[PDB]
Amino acid sequence: MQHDLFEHDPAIRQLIGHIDNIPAPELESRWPRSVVDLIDVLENELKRQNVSNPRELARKQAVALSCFLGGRQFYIPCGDTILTALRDDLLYCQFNGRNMEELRRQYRLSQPQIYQIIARQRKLHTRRH
Amino acid sequence: APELESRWPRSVVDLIDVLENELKRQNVSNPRELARKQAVALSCFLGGRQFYIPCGDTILTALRDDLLYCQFNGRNMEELRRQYRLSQPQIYQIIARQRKLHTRRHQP
Amino acid sequence: LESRWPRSVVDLIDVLENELKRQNVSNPRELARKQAVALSCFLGGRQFYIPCGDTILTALRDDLLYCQFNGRNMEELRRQYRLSQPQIYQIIARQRKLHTRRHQP
Amino acid sequence: FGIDMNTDYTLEEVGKQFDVTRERIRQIEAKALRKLRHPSRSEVLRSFLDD
Amino acid sequence: DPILLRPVDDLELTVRSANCLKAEAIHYIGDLVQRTEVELLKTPNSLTEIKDVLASRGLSLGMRLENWPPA
Amino acid sequence: VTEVEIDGVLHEYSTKEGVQEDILEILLNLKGLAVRVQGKDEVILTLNKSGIGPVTAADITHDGDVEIVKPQHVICHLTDENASISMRIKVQRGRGYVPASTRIHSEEDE
Amino acid sequence: GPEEITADIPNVGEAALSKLDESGIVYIGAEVTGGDILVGKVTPKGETQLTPEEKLLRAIFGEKASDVKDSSLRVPNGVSGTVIDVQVFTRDGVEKDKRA
């Protein structure tokens, strides 16, 4: 089942699937400069992962990024927090509600912290739907 | 609590999923890992700075616009105006613009 | 033929009528009919283009937001409306002066 | 950063020279830091992360 | 002939004629040069600006071409 | 013979209980295996043996497209009745002499 | 600070660490070529002077070098072989690693 964000609004989803018929250089000409800085940055990591169609794929992430946070005020932190957030997300997913002790060894975090992590991503895993 | 979230990294989390649903929709291998590294680049790229992200469908216009020119077949000017809820001036403008665009494609 | 079709006239009556019944107005059908005659006389033969893109709907959407704006509730009015803060900043400042003259002519 | 000078100048030290504005000079700094992070001038610099 | 393979986009024609021709979904030049003048006039809005450009480009309607389209 | 896999053996410088000779002697005995393959160019061979007595090439599980020239060519010796040896043998086809460095240099997989 | 033996080593690709266990010791029988890491050793790194250019690079990319210095044992160049035995001696009182 196509259960996710573009499921709610196929119109945006179909637009994402329509960029293949339009080549890049003319389409980026009409775009604001900022997303042009995004796409190549998103491209930069992509070829480091040796994934095909770096230009084609990178566009798909950029439009979806603009789709949600378009209209929304978005802040970004930097530094050690990111992999802390990355570690938190893996902990939440690994957390099957039965391997909390396994995570207690996998991530080794204080018990109140684990609840805070578990609670916090729960909010993040509720507003989407 | 909202002010506590003001500097909160919650936004970072919200994004991996934003990347997920298109990567999962596009069906690439391993959503989560691709999207997290994908986010880390943005973090280093955009750390600690004011950024205007094109808001409120502005990008989606360009894709809405491309499909409409494709379905413009010369006498259905009413048809695609209902189905996009657009108006005569909008239709005419987009038509002429994408016409010039393709003419630059067919012509050298 | 549609560009020369006398079909729109009748379409105006029910659009008027369904509003009149919503506003609990008596005899809404007959009231809407004579209104349609009133539109026909003035608008007859005139190239008359009206604003699209919810032009009155936004200006009213503008008003009640300014009613809910408490000087701190920027974010929730953002979520409820899907409008981004930048434009909300501008509209609220405009509505500020607009209701400023409303409260103080 | 003290490039080609005997010492680096802090935010206060550079404020007394051009402008006492703190956030302004800091955001010009951030402007430069992004402009360097674009993958149009960072390609060569990326090879020095291994050291 | 190097023109039968080129699409309709190489005419630089008027907007009225451009709108009229594509209402019938024409994509190549050859099918214009295939149909004669006695059926294309039924389309509303055209009769005064095709012959001149066709002569300028060295083409004329009414002639017969086999193996069309050649794909 | 180009590649040999034996259960319970990590490297060629170890020994197994019940086997009279060393793993190096096993590989040198394998080096002199006369095998003919008709259809394909790469064949996986399986050898299983348990008991006391010499192990010959006749104990390899014969395949329809593999011909063993010398079935009496001894390959290993077992001294304990409970001792068992399971071995997987990989045979390719080629020409010339190929040392053990070129194949590992050419193939990049782990 | 005391030196530690671990598989966690800075700025080294996981390909070079594929032959190490979770304890940082190469497995027995692992074929190893010149330049590989037989045992991962980490030594605490003293305070380092930062020149203007490298600190500019740190500001640009944001990575930070922790209190770590790579001093692991490497196979000498031009030597290729297989590890046939590893032996670990540890002092009395200090805890033994799972490999030990």
XYZ file of C-alpha atoms in Angstrom:
674
model
C 0.000 0.000 0.000
C 1.341 3.508 -0.859
C 0.961 4.671 2.790
C 2.860 7.966 3.320
C 2.775 11.759 2.751
C 2.182 11.875 -1.027
C -0.626 9.329 -0.424
C -2.796 12.050 1.215
C -2.396 14.360 -1.839
C -1.710 12.406 -5.101
C -1.782 15.725 -7.042
C 1.607 16.702 -5.514
C 2.676 13.023 -5.868
C 1.839 12.958 -9.627
C 3.698 16.289 -10.113
C 6.755 14.613 -8.474
C 6.335 11.793 -11.045
C 6.011 14.320 -13.884
C 9.455 15.943 -13.638
C 10.946 13.133 -15.729
C 9.338 14.539 -18.883
C 10.943 17.958 -18.274
C 14.770 18.120 -18.510
C 16.643 19.902 -15.745
C 18.298 23.108 -17.031
C 15.136 24.839 -18.256
C 13.107 23.813 -15.199
C 15.723 25.083 -12.744
C 15.786 28.406 -14.595
C 12.237 29.124 -13.401
C 13.027 27.997 -9.896
C 14.087 30.260 -7.037
C 17.824 30.335 -6.423
C 17.635 28.740 -2.975
C 16.361 25.340 -4.123
C 19.122 25.356 -6.738
C 21.566 25.500 -3.844
C 19.619 22.664 -2.227
C 19.499 20.309 -5.213
C 23.250 20.268 -5.875
C 23.874 19.838 -2.151
C 21.392 16.958 -2.137
C 23.155 15.800 -5.303
C 26.534 15.994 -3.579
C 25.707 13.328 -1.005
C 23.955 11.239 -3.648
C 26.953 10.454 -5.858
C 28.857 9.697 -2.662
C 26.290 6.925 -2.152
C 26.827 5.828 -5.783
C 23.119 6.014 -6.596
C 21.956 6.337 -10.194
C 20.423 9.472 -11.735
C 21.830 12.049 -9.282
C 20.172 14.961 -11.073
C 16.840 13.175 -11.505
C 16.589 11.899 -7.936
C 17.833 15.104 -6.289
C 14.965 17.046 -7.850
C 12.445 14.637 -6.327
C 13.625 15.326 -2.779
C 13.784 19.086 -3.314
C 10.179 19.417 -4.476
C 8.843 17.278 -1.625
C 10.872 19.329 0.857
C 9.278 22.482 -0.517
C 5.875 20.785 -0.534
C 5.636 20.278 3.233
C 7.678 23.135 4.696
C 6.230 25.458 2.102
C 4.085 27.675 4.295
C 5.780 26.465 7.493
C 8.460 28.197 9.566
C 11.346 25.735 9.824
C 14.435 25.928 12.053
C 17.559 23.776 11.850
C 20.151 22.949 14.518
C 23.706 21.824 13.775
C 26.544 20.022 15.498
C 26.375 16.976 17.739
C 22.580 17.278 17.965
C 22.022 15.846 14.482
C 23.485 12.401 15.151
C 21.921 12.668 18.594
C 18.646 13.087 16.719
C 19.750 10.347 14.325
C 20.556 8.094 17.283
C 17.199 8.979 18.836
C 15.318 7.966 15.690
C 17.072 4.604 15.404
C 16.349 4.022 19.087
C 12.661 4.750 18.510
C 12.455 2.348 15.542
C 14.610 -0.384 17.160
C 12.259 0.151 20.152
C 9.624 -2.556 19.462
C 8.268 -1.920 22.988
C 9.959 -5.223 23.952
C 13.690 -4.496 23.337
C 13.986 -1.350 25.537
C 16.665 -3.279 27.518
C 18.352 -4.174 24.179
C 18.411 -0.412 23.377
C 19.627 0.202 26.976
C 22.715 -1.746 25.769
C 22.576 -0.522 22.119
C 22.347 3.198 23.090
C 23.015 3.018 26.879
C 20.792 6.011 27.868
C 19.344 6.904 31.329
C 15.848 5.493 31.920
C 14.091 8.920 32.045
C 15.960 9.920 28.884
C 14.720 6.816 27.062
C 11.137 7.694 27.977
C 11.720 11.271 26.825
C 13.097 9.925 23.549
C 10.242 7.433 23.238
C 7.656 10.077 24.102
C 9.183 12.739 21.873
C 9.282 10.710 18.647
C 5.762 9.535 19.472
C 4.598 13.122 19.036
C 6.652 13.273 15.834
C 4.988 10.024 14.786
C 1.444 11.327 15.295
C 1.188 14.722 13.595
C 1.967 13.355 10.125
C -1.259 11.390 9.658
C 6.994 24.332 25.804
C 6.615 25.865 22.266
C 9.499 28.278 23.093
C 11.381 25.197 24.414
C 10.763 23.597 20.967
C 11.773 26.879 19.219
C 15.459 25.772 19.337
C 14.442 22.066 19.489
C 15.894 19.698 16.822
C 12.363 18.218 16.432
C 12.450 19.907 12.971
C 15.408 17.650 12.014
C 13.291 14.556 12.896
C 10.245 15.865 11.005
C 12.455 15.950 7.881
C 13.785 12.357 7.669
C 10.119 11.314 7.155
C 9.631 14.146 4.585
C 12.508 12.458 2.698
C 11.128 9.001 3.496
C 7.748 9.332 1.853
C 9.149 10.389 -1.514
C 11.995 7.856 -1.408
C 9.575 5.115 -0.372
C 7.118 6.336 -3.017
C 9.886 6.393 -5.628
C 10.882 2.944 -4.280
C 14.611 3.194 -3.632
C 16.436 0.704 -1.421
C 16.720 1.518 2.300
C 14.680 4.674 3.049
C 15.904 5.507 6.541
C 19.670 5.461 6.069
C 19.551 7.345 2.788
C 17.376 10.093 4.261
C 19.378 10.623 7.465
C 22.683 11.144 5.643
C 20.593 13.232 3.243
C 19.607 15.443 6.176
C 23.141 15.712 7.563
C 24.208 17.479 4.387
C 21.474 20.076 4.913
C 22.572 20.541 8.516
C 26.167 21.284 7.524
C 24.977 23.257 4.502
C 22.540 25.393 6.468
C 23.871 25.406 10.038
C 22.840 28.409 12.125
C 21.454 30.736 9.441
C 18.310 32.520 8.158
C 16.924 30.719 5.093
C 13.875 31.495 2.968
C 12.414 28.228 1.711
C 10.031 28.782 -1.226
C 6.694 28.437 0.491
C 3.101 27.675 -0.395
C 3.103 25.644 -3.643
C 5.369 28.088 -5.541
C 7.433 25.158 -6.762
C 4.244 23.125 -7.245
C 3.017 25.793 -9.658
C 5.867 24.954 -12.016
C 4.802 21.307 -12.045
C 1.105 22.133 -12.192
C 2.048 24.435 -15.053
C 3.958 21.820 -17.060
C 1.184 19.226 -17.057
C -1.421 21.813 -18.054
C 0.548 22.845 -21.140
C 0.767 19.152 -22.024
C -3.017 18.765 -21.799
C -3.725 22.015 -23.661
C -4.927 20.627 -27.000
C -6.175 23.819 -28.663
C -9.919 23.862 -28.048
C -10.377 22.625 -24.444
C -9.568 26.025 -22.885
C -12.649 25.579 -20.700
C -11.876 21.971 -19.750
C -8.548 22.496 -17.986
C -9.846 25.698 -16.403
C -12.489 23.831 -14.406
C -10.136 20.967 -13.619
C -7.507 23.370 -12.276
C -10.024 26.017 -11.080
C -7.791 28.515 -12.917
C -9.039 31.428 -15.060
C -8.856 32.560 -18.740
C -5.915 35.010 -18.166
C -3.907 32.351 -16.246
C -4.558 29.745 -18.986
C -3.514 32.154 -21.808
C -0.316 33.237 -19.970
C 0.859 29.675 -19.135
C 0.000 28.566 -22.723
C 2.068 31.300 -24.443
C 4.984 30.825 -21.985
C 5.312 27.018 -22.435
C 4.743 27.457 -26.219
C 7.806 29.743 -26.406
C 9.588 27.182 -24.165
C 8.972 24.214 -26.558
C 9.687 26.405 -29.644
C 13.179 26.976 -28.141
C 13.378 23.146 -27.802
C 12.306 22.234 -31.387
C 14.211 25.221 -32.876
C 18.033 25.228 -32.351
C -22.768 28.049 -28.091
C -22.009 28.262 -24.321
C -20.408 31.703 -24.960
C -23.865 32.593 -26.404
C -25.952 30.248 -24.173
C -28.684 31.802 -21.934
C -27.952 29.080 -19.306
C -25.908 31.149 -16.781
C -29.014 33.236 -15.840
C -30.758 30.253 -14.198
C -27.476 29.240 -12.548
C -27.511 32.599 -10.758
C -30.941 32.031 -9.190
C -30.112 28.887 -7.207
C -26.698 30.201 -6.144
C -28.619 33.178 -4.798
C -31.468 31.023 -3.479
C -29.339 28.523 -1.548
C -27.753 31.469 0.245
C -31.105 33.110 1.017
C -32.438 29.895 2.557
C -29.190 29.687 4.529
C -29.812 33.250 5.755
C -33.398 32.221 6.666
C -34.875 34.704 4.191
C -38.517 34.324 3.194
C -39.608 33.595 -0.394
C -35.992 32.888 -1.443
C -36.857 31.528 -4.899
C -38.910 34.531 -6.023
C -36.424 36.869 -4.345
C -33.547 35.251 -6.245
C -35.443 35.428 -9.549
C -35.962 39.200 -9.486
C -32.336 39.547 -8.411
C -31.358 37.604 -11.539
C -33.359 40.113 -13.583
C -31.462 42.904 -11.816
C -28.126 41.333 -12.782
C -29.279 40.864 -16.378
C -30.230 44.514 -16.930
C -26.998 46.008 -15.586
C -24.614 43.312 -16.856
C -26.349 42.907 -20.225
C -23.927 43.293 -23.106
C -21.046 44.520 -20.929
C -17.638 42.834 -20.915
C -17.512 42.414 -17.138
C -14.704 40.347 -15.592
C -14.807 39.609 -11.854
C -11.907 38.711 -9.505
C -10.957 35.048 -9.235
C -8.722 33.185 -6.811
C -11.002 33.568 -3.767
C -10.488 37.350 -3.829
C -13.341 38.153 -1.455
C -12.838 34.872 0.407
C -9.259 35.747 1.384
C -10.127 39.307 2.436
C -12.721 37.749 4.733
C -10.278 34.988 5.637
C -8.036 37.949 6.458
C -10.554 39.517 8.836
C -11.328 36.741 11.306
C -7.651 35.839 11.581
C -7.015 39.385 12.783
C -9.799 38.744 15.291
C -7.999 35.625 16.550
C -4.571 37.301 16.523
C -3.649 38.022 20.149
C -0.070 39.211 19.573
C 1.304 35.819 20.642
C -0.712 33.262 18.648
C 1.233 33.620 15.383
C 2.021 29.925 15.082
C -1.418 28.383 15.678
C -3.005 30.806 13.208
C -0.308 29.620 10.810
C -1.334 25.973 11.242
C -5.073 26.668 11.105
C -4.734 28.623 7.855
C -1.739 27.047 6.044
C -0.616 30.616 5.315
C 3.107 31.206 5.980
C 4.132 33.751 8.687
C 5.799 36.210 6.196
C 2.449 37.093 4.521
C 0.663 36.734 7.915
C 3.067 39.412 9.252
C 2.020 41.754 6.401
C -1.757 41.003 6.490
C -1.842 41.371 10.323
C -0.052 44.759 10.067
C -2.572 45.823 7.365
C -5.531 44.503 9.438
C -3.872 46.287 12.405
C -4.386 49.698 10.712
C -7.690 48.497 9.154
C -9.236 47.650 12.569
C -7.302 50.616 14.062
C -9.533 52.950 11.973
C -12.472 50.580 12.720
C -11.930 51.055 16.501
C -10.665 54.660 16.041
C -12.216 56.251 12.882
C 40.647 33.948 11.393
C 44.005 35.727 11.388
C 45.028 34.666 7.888
C 48.254 36.434 6.863
C 48.322 38.450 10.110
C 50.259 38.148 13.353
C 47.016 37.639 15.279
C 43.321 37.031 14.776
C 40.807 39.690 15.767
C 37.744 38.814 17.827
C 34.247 40.161 17.194
C 34.894 43.187 19.411
C 38.260 43.825 17.754
C 36.730 43.805 14.267
C 33.725 45.814 15.445
C 35.821 48.852 16.345
C 37.266 48.819 12.814
C 34.239 48.547 10.523
C 31.002 48.485 12.521
C 30.092 47.939 16.175
C 27.190 45.812 14.957
C 27.548 42.289 16.349
C 24.804 40.309 14.633
C 25.416 42.046 11.305
C 29.066 41.028 11.114
C 28.173 37.577 12.433
C 25.629 37.071 9.662
C 28.099 38.280 7.022
C 30.371 35.604 8.475
C 27.604 33.020 8.086
C 27.049 34.301 4.553
C 30.668 33.537 3.723
C 30.522 30.149 5.448
C 27.605 29.026 3.294
C 29.096 30.526 0.131
C 32.166 28.381 0.790
C 30.062 25.282 1.518
C 28.404 25.270 -1.905
C 29.630 22.319 -4.014
C 31.021 24.702 -6.630
C 34.073 25.896 -4.688
C 34.159 23.135 -2.024
C 35.196 20.326 -4.400
C 38.924 20.828 -3.822
C 38.502 21.725 -0.147
C 36.591 18.492 0.470
C 39.815 16.574 -0.172
C 41.399 18.052 2.965
C 38.886 16.606 5.448
C 40.928 13.397 5.642
C 43.660 15.465 7.326
C 13.115 15.699 -48.405
C 14.537 17.138 -45.172
C 11.307 18.919 -44.188
C 8.748 16.078 -44.068
C 10.505 14.740 -40.951
C 10.431 18.110 -39.179
C 7.413 18.861 -36.955
C 4.965 21.760 -37.267
C 7.059 23.883 -34.896
C 9.305 25.169 -37.727
C 6.759 27.507 -39.355
C 6.933 30.651 -37.161
C 3.286 31.119 -38.104
C 0.516 33.247 -36.621
C -1.118 32.406 -33.301
C -4.542 32.029 -34.939
C -3.267 29.511 -37.494
C -1.145 27.788 -34.842
C -4.218 27.344 -32.635
C -6.375 26.219 -35.563
C -3.992 23.557 -36.891
C -3.365 21.873 -33.530
C -7.091 21.530 -32.790
C -6.917 18.513 -35.118
C -3.680 17.215 -33.484
C -1.133 17.712 -36.253
C 2.480 16.917 -35.362
C 4.513 16.746 -38.619
C 4.602 18.948 -41.725
C 3.781 16.075 -44.077
C 0.137 15.722 -43.090
C -0.407 19.455 -43.662
C 1.101 19.090 -47.130
C -1.059 15.975 -47.584
C -4.506 17.502 -47.070
C -5.847 19.828 -49.752
C -7.342 23.286 -49.315
C -10.969 22.158 -49.735
C -11.289 20.440 -46.339
C -9.090 22.516 -44.003
C -11.300 25.599 -44.481
C -14.137 24.060 -42.448
C -12.185 24.783 -39.263
C -13.184 28.170 -37.793
C -10.574 30.931 -37.986
C -6.512 31.028 -41.932
C -6.956 31.102 -45.701
C -4.599 34.039 -46.360
C -1.287 33.147 -44.694
C -0.395 29.517 -45.516
C 0.328 29.777 -49.245
C 2.875 32.584 -48.858
C 4.914 30.851 -46.145
C 4.663 27.524 -47.985
C 6.051 29.127 -51.149
C 8.768 30.808 -49.077
C 9.715 27.377 -47.694
C 9.300 25.710 -51.099
C 6.237 23.590 -50.317
C 2.640 23.399 -51.498
C -0.500 21.507 -50.541
C -2.262 18.969 -52.735
C 0.718 16.815 -53.677
C 0.835 13.075 -53.010
C 3.463 11.283 -50.918
C 3.636 7.512 -50.488
C 4.979 5.501 -47.502
C 3.769 8.231 -45.139
C 4.516 8.340 -42.281
C 7.846 6.487 -42.634
C 8.179 6.173 -38.826
C 41.300 -27.490 -8.606
C 41.474 -23.844 -7.587
C 39.485 -23.374 -4.373
C 38.891 -25.787 -1.496
C 36.537 -25.364 1.454
C 36.702 -27.646 4.495
C 34.342 -27.516 7.491
C 35.937 -26.579 10.824
C 39.143 -25.300 9.179
C 40.082 -21.617 9.184
C 43.457 -21.620 7.411
C 45.779 -24.051 5.656
C 48.278 -24.032 8.549
C 46.032 -25.952 10.961
C 45.247 -29.627 11.520
C 42.143 -31.730 12.083
C 41.753 -34.675 14.435
C 41.781 -38.087 12.801
C 43.513 -36.891 9.623
C 46.979 -38.393 9.282
C 48.495 -35.600 7.205
C 48.291 -31.809 7.351
C 46.017 -29.413 5.484
C 48.932 -28.336 3.285
C 49.389 -31.958 2.236
C 45.653 -32.088 1.523
C 45.910 -29.087 -0.788
C 49.002 -30.467 -2.519
C 47.158 -33.749 -3.083
C 44.211 -31.784 -4.482
C 46.567 -29.925 -6.828
C 47.136 -33.197 -8.681
C 43.480 -33.938 -9.427
C 42.686 -34.880 -13.035
C 39.115 -33.729 -13.666
C 37.286 -33.333 -16.975
C 34.211 -31.118 -17.351
C 32.089 -31.301 -20.504
C 29.301 -28.747 -20.277
C 30.220 -25.827 -18.053
C 33.419 -24.043 -17.041
C 32.976 -23.779 -13.254
C 32.069 -26.805 -11.130
C 31.562 -27.188 -7.380
C 32.542 -30.639 -6.121
C 31.529 -32.206 -2.822
C 33.503 -34.793 -0.856
C 32.147 -36.509 2.260
C 33.867 -39.390 4.038
C 33.750 -40.951 7.496
C 35.605 -43.978 8.810
C 39.130 -45.364 8.963
C 41.139 -45.782 5.785
C 42.553 -43.849 2.849
C 40.419 -41.297 1.031
C 40.554 -41.430 -2.763
C 39.042 -39.401 -5.582
C 36.369 -42.082 -6.007
C 34.707 -40.811 -2.817
C 33.762 -37.507 -4.450
C 30.026 -37.375 -5.116
C 30.119 -37.911 -8.861
C 28.282 -35.545 -11.187
C 26.841 -36.148 -14.630
C 29.111 -33.598 -16.326
C 32.325 -34.319 -14.396
C 34.741 -37.113 -15.311
C 37.380 -38.292 -12.832
C 40.417 -39.724 -14.605
C 42.033 -41.358 -11.557
C 39.534 -42.737 -9.016
C 42.362 -44.436 -7.083
C 44.316 -41.193 -6.551
C 44.589 -40.944 -2.765
C 43.695 -37.568 -1.278
C 43.529 -37.915 2.533
C 43.990 -40.442 5.333
C 41.611 -40.966 8.257
C 42.731 -42.658 11.472
C 39.712 -42.356 13.801
C 36.405 -44.104 13.139
C 34.421 -41.181 14.545
C 36.451 -38.777 12.392
C 34.513 -37.287 9.482
C 35.634 -34.930 6.723
C 33.354 -32.742 4.592
C 34.944 -30.769 1.777
C 33.716 -28.516 -1.022
C 35.936 -28.332 -4.099
C 35.652 -25.633 -6.761
C 37.051 -26.279 -10.239
C 37.341 -23.769 -13.059
C 38.711 -24.182 -16.568
C 41.621 -22.254 -18.006
C 45.031 -22.385 -19.628
C 48.554 -21.736 -18.434
C 49.685 -21.433 -14.824
C 47.911 -19.097 -12.414
C 49.535 -18.355 -9.036
C 47.477 -17.427 -5.977
C 48.131 -13.676 -6.323
C 46.556 -12.916 -9.701
C 43.150 -14.369 -8.827
C 42.871 -12.448 -5.553
C 44.094 -9.267 -7.267
C 41.543 -9.577 -10.078
C 38.491 -10.430 -7.956
C 37.444 -7.603 -5.634
C 34.678 -9.272 -3.622
C 35.320 -10.329 -0.032
C 45.317 8.696 29.515
C 45.480 4.923 29.157
C 45.596 3.558 25.630
C 42.659 1.419 24.528
C 42.366 -1.398 21.994
C 39.140 -1.037 20.045
C 37.584 -1.318 16.610
C 36.454 2.325 16.880
C 39.086 4.249 14.914
C 38.742 7.777 13.484
C 38.801 8.543 9.754
C 39.090 4.919 8.628
C 36.670 3.280 6.221
C 34.722 0.229 7.326
C 36.438 -1.782 4.579
C 39.700 -1.745 6.536
C 37.758 -2.694 9.682
C 35.994 -5.677 8.088
C 38.696 -8.075 9.328
C 38.434 -6.907 12.953
C 35.957 -8.268 15.469
C 34.020 -6.105 17.920
C 37.057 -6.299 20.220
C 39.501 -4.914 17.647
C 41.519 -8.093 16.994
C 41.846 -9.691 13.563
C 40.218 -13.109 13.311
C 42.372 -16.218 13.148
C 42.961 -17.357 9.589
C 42.117 -13.985 8.051
C 44.173 -13.349 4.934
C 45.875 -9.977 5.286
C 47.927 -7.901 2.854
C 50.432 -5.131 3.475
C 48.994 -2.010 5.077
C 45.960 -3.539 6.789
C 45.116 -3.064 10.469
C 45.819 -6.184 12.517
C 44.799 -4.611 15.845
C 43.107 -1.271 16.393
C 44.884 0.812 19.026
C 43.753 4.270 20.139
C 45.929 6.661 22.122
C 44.658 9.844 23.816
C 45.623 12.909 21.807
C 47.219 15.921 23.443
C 46.263 19.513 22.777
C 46.979 20.452 19.158
C 47.705 23.894 17.734
C 45.180 24.949 15.090
C 46.478 27.087 12.222
C 44.160 29.655 10.611
C 43.427 27.562 7.526
C 42.588 24.264 9.226
C 40.361 26.016 11.756
C 38.640 27.740 8.838
C 38.080 24.260 7.404
C 36.693 23.044 10.731
C 34.291 25.991 10.795
C 33.245 25.277 7.203
C 32.593 21.555 7.653
C 31.907 21.368 11.390
C 33.764 18.140 12.130
C 35.699 18.000 15.402
C 38.674 15.777 16.205
C 38.189 14.209 19.635
C 40.816 13.078 22.150
C 41.992 10.271 19.865
C 45.166 9.403 17.968
C 45.553 6.459 15.606
C 48.529 4.274 16.541
C 47.180 0.875 15.515
C 49.449 -1.943 14.416
C 49.650 -2.242 10.635
C 51.144 -4.996 8.509
C 54.490 -3.779 7.114
C 54.383 -2.940 3.426
C 55.025 -5.713 0.939
C 54.103 -8.496 3.383
C 51.092 -10.722 2.708
C 50.021 -13.721 4.744
C 47.414 -15.333 6.963
C 47.049 -14.852 10.709
C 47.590 -18.270 12.274
C 47.611 -17.334 15.975
C 46.958 -14.359 18.249
C 48.088 -14.201 21.882
C 46.886 -11.647 24.437
C 48.587 -10.961 27.765
C 46.922 -8.564 30.193
C 47.957 -7.132 33.537
C 46.428 -8.402 36.755
C 43.613 -6.151 37.919
C 42.627 -4.675 34.565
C 39.546 -6.241 33.008
C 39.989 -8.677 30.134
C 38.321 -8.097 26.785
C 35.874 -10.628 25.357
C 38.522 -11.805 22.890
C 40.826 -12.566 25.808
